Design a protein around this ligand. Structure first.
Ligand SMILES: [Fe+3]
Ligand SMILES: [Fe+3]
Lengths: 200, 198
């Protein structure tokens, strides 16, 4: 089979408690993310797109094929941007990049929280490495991709589609954002500084 | 400045199709929030004396988003009711059968539109300028008024907050429940004269 496969979650579904619940991971990974994979496969089965990489589909396609391919990528990136036993202050190369751009971790936390809180409708917040070598924050809408929009190399992302938080926080996206800081996986950011993430 | 218009029914009256908890957040937090945010955005500005429709037609950005969502949600509550649903009645039945052939065909076509909308948005039954019914969608806070898609007759919210409490990812089950709530009397009122927000 040439079908795309959903990459494994990097942790069990209870490991992000109390910040993101079991029930949220069960639906967000088990229904939404799994759903994007199944839908993409349905759309490209028997077509010449069958042998494309996910990045090739993101860069080269539009419409439903784009939307599903990009969401598959974005969610895999999201799960890796979080973890159990993470959070807290940035360490290593990403700490230097954050200080160089924002002056301090606290300023970054303020700016990125405001960006995440401010996004209207469905979308994503990203910490990226720009071509000039400096860090920045950007947002995309719906399935929007920093790859397609050439916004920089993704380092971390936070999903602000309502399904990411509604089970646990209902309309209170700000409490979800505050909780997400307890989960952020700086090691993933540091790996992405070494080399761009390639989906597999 | 603007006040949130009262729900047309009690918050337990759409059970078992939409829960009390859903209405408490969707009306009490989201819809109320758009009113509060709009009021804070326009206070002390020349926009403070504009009608909701005027803000929808003449502004962009956050003022538009909040103004349009206020209108869209009020339209949504009126598009539903207790002891409604079922097959269409009155003049809207006629227009539906003329355009779509049968109610069953309409229900399939509009359900597919609602199910297929990617991201946050709205589905609408409208009256076009040629006097025929049609179905259209808008994205995020998009308004049929601003995009000149026809006169709104009914709408269904497919932002995830409209259904996540009750149906989680299963928007199709939410859509099927919405059909049990559809208020054909509101559609027929809107055929006689366009809805004016108050
Ligand atoms: Fe998501
Ligand atoms: Fe809504």
């Amino acid at each position: 089979s040439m079908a795309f496969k959903l990459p494994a979650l990097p942790y069990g579904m209870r490991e992000l408690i109390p910040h993101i619940s079991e029930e949220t991971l069960s639906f967000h990974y088990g229904k939404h993310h799994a759903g994007y994979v199944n839908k993409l496969n349905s759309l490209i089965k028997g077509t010449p797109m069958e042998s494309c990489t996910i990045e090739e589909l993101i860069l080269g396609q539009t419409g439903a094929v784009f939307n599903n391919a990009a969401q598959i990528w974005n969610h895999t990136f999201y799960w890796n941007s979080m973890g159990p036993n993470c959070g807290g202050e940035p360490t290593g190369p990403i700490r230097k990049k954050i200080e160089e751009k924002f002056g301090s971790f606290s300023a970054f936390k303020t700016d990125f929280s405001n960006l995440l809180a401010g996004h209207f409708g469905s979308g994503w917040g990203w910490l990226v490495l720009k071509d000039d070598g400096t860090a920045d924050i950007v947002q995309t809408h719906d399935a929007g991709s920093p790859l397609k929009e050439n916004l920089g190399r993704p380092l971390l992302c936070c999903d602000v589609w309502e399904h990411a938080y509604y089970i646990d926080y209902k309309n209170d996206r700000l409490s979800y954002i505050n909780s997400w800081w307890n989960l952020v996986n700086w090691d993933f950011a540091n790996k992405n500084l070494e080399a761009p993430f390639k989906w597999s």
